[PDB]
């Protein structure tokens, strides 16, 4: 109460492992400049591993910059380039490594940022064929190189 203060918590550090992929499918990645429009701190909140797909600004004042894709913009669906897997320090550098061709399981994709963690997204899996993905197992097979 007063002379003896009991236990409390100072810090709570929860550490996750990384987004798995197939060994024998081959990873292909290219680094991209970051569009400063969206709030990248809101995509990189939790320690749980997520991997959101990324489209690219084709032409304009920001031609070459990339940004997380919205499932209601038809140009963002027609300009997708890949997904960012391992998370990124959004302010220590803008430039992010976007994987073009890999294979990621069904639950590690989260294109809504306010979505449940490590659970399969519904609107991604319902809109995969227009978005040039393919599922065979849970693992999203994709090649945006091709």
């Amino acid at each position: 109460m007063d002379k003896v203060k009991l236990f409390q918590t100072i810090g709570r550090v929860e550490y996750w492992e990384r987004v798995p992929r197939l060994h024998a499918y081959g990873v292909f990645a290219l680094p991209f400049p970051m569009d400063p429009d969206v709030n990248w701190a809101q995509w990189f909140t939790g320690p749980h591993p997520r991997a959101f797909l990324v489209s690219i600004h084709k032409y304009g004042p920001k031609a070459g910059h990339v940004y997380p894709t919205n499932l209601t913009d038809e140009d963002a669906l027609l300009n997708v380039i890949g997904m960012v897997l391992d998370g990124h320090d959004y302010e220590n550098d803008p430039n992010v490594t976007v994987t073009l061709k890999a294979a990621v399981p069904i639950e590690y994709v989260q294109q809504d940022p306010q979505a449940p963690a490590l659970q399969p997204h519904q609107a991604v899996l319902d809109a995969a064929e227009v978005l040039k993905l393919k599922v065979i197992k849970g693992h999203y097979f994709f090649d945006y190189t091709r």
């Binding site: 003896v4 203060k5 009991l6 236990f7 409390q8 918590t9 100072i10 810090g11 709570r12 550090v13 929860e14 550490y15 996750w16 492992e17 990384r18 987004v19 798995p20 992929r21 197939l22 060994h23 024998a24 499918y25 749980h48 591993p49 399981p105 590690y108 490590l118 197992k137 693992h139």
Partner: protein, 51 residues
């Protein structure tokens, strides 16, 4: 309460709690002549305590 002696006034116990990632999971079943599939991701946690 067996007695004990010290030279300093206040007493601080700092506890470091540790929830390691439990070695769970079974190896995935496959047929001979196939490319393997990867494992899931697991979580470990560290919390502390001051008294």
């Amino acid at each position: 309460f067996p007695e004990d002696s010290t030279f300093a006034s206040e007493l601080e116990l700092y506890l470091l709690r540790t929830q390691d990632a439990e070695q769970t999971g079974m190896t995935f079943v496959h047929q001979v002549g196939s490319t393997s599939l990867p494992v899931e991701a697991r979580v470990a946690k560290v919390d502390l305590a001051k008294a």
